[PDB]
Design a protein around this ligand. Structure first.
Ligand SMILES: [Zn+2]
Lengths: 124, 196
């Protein structure tokens, strides 16, 4: 199952393996046990180039995991500034609330990521 | 027989590894395509714990080896007699245990009273400030080829997140080859996978 392999390749940051899997049409909308898509996983780990290729490929920028988080939630929580910027440009929803009622801005605040919180507030 | 099933659980538990490549002198390297770590005997093997939410204080992290092949899975993974008797303990690890943790004075080593399986367990601690994951430094104390022990049989390492009473919170696993030339062997096994 190429979707399962794409999830793990995106998580571990294997650019070459991500390229081969997508060249074989691996499902960019696959979800892991936590409901995370490849875009979620690359946004969590900080793999900017994989985030960008997934966005060029019809990945849902606002897909939600089992806790209601979007990829922008993850990038804002961890503090991946460049990924936050590309997700916003691709249409990430700044108002999406997870199952704790938190927007990405709220997670940026909660995790001390000041610059990202400023970026998100100007995009509100 | 110990479960090897991936179970990310309520805390969203995943494992991460370094990007170490396949150069001639590499000491530990992880193949995502194989979900397999290649490492040299007794060298530091960093394993990253990634969690979507922080498990509570009192959570513990256990590591245990099992044989990957079904016909060997019921046999306890142990060090070979040569290495068991070579007096190389750090003073914490029993000399028969394959998996050690380095750099953690709160490590505990368990010999299961019923199954006789070995495991090594540390307290879970959240990431250090600035960090996104908790790293544990494992050491593997026999080569896969050790004839009195693993005798060229592949093993899995099972990492379990447990509460203070031993209940399951999350589980992940990866194959391990302990060998002289991890970079060469990773490159070889990844090329073989491309052919098959
Ligand atoms: Zn040995």
């Amino acid at each position: 199952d190429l979707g399962k392999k794409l999830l793990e390749a995106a998580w571990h940051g294997q650019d070459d393996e991500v390229r081969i899997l997508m060249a074989n049409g691996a499902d960019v909308n696959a979800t892991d046990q936590s409901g995370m898509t490849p875009l979620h996983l690359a946004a969590w780990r900080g793999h900017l180039e994989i985030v960008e290729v997934l966005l060029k490929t019809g990945a849902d920028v606002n897909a939600i995991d089992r806790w209601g988080k979007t990829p922008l939630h993850l990038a804002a929580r961890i503090g991946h500034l460049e990924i936050v910027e590309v997700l916003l440009k691709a249409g990430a929803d700044v108002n999406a609330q997870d199952k704790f009622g938190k927007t990405p801005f709220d997670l940026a605040i909660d995790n001390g990521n000041e610059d990202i919180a400023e970026v998100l507030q100007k995009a509100a | 027989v110990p479960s090897q099933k991936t179970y990310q659980g309520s805390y969203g538990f995943r494992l991460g590894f370094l990007h170490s490549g396949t150069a001639k002198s590499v000491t530990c390297t992880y193949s995502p395509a194989l979900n397999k770590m290649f490492c040299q005997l007794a060298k530091t093997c960093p394993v990253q714990l990634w969690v979507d939410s922080t498990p509570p204080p009192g959570t513990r992290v256990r590591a245990m080896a099992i044989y990957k092949q079904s016909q060997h899975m019921t046999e306890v993974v142990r060090r070979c007699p040569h290495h068991e008797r070579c007096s190389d303990s750090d003073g914490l690890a029993p000399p028969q245990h394959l998996i050690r943790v380095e750099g953690n004075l709160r490590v505990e080593y368990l010999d299961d009273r019923n199954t006789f399986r070995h495991s090594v367990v540390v307290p879970y601690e959240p990431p250090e400030v600035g960090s996104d994951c908790t790293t544990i430094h494992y050491n593997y104390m026999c080569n896969s080829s050790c004839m009195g022990g693993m005798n060229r049989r592949p093993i899995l390492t099972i990492i379990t997140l447990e509460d203070s009473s031993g209940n399951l919170l999350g589980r992940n696993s990866f194959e391990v080859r302990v060998c002289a030339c991890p970079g060469r062997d990773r490159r070889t096994e990844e090329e073989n996978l491309r052919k098959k």
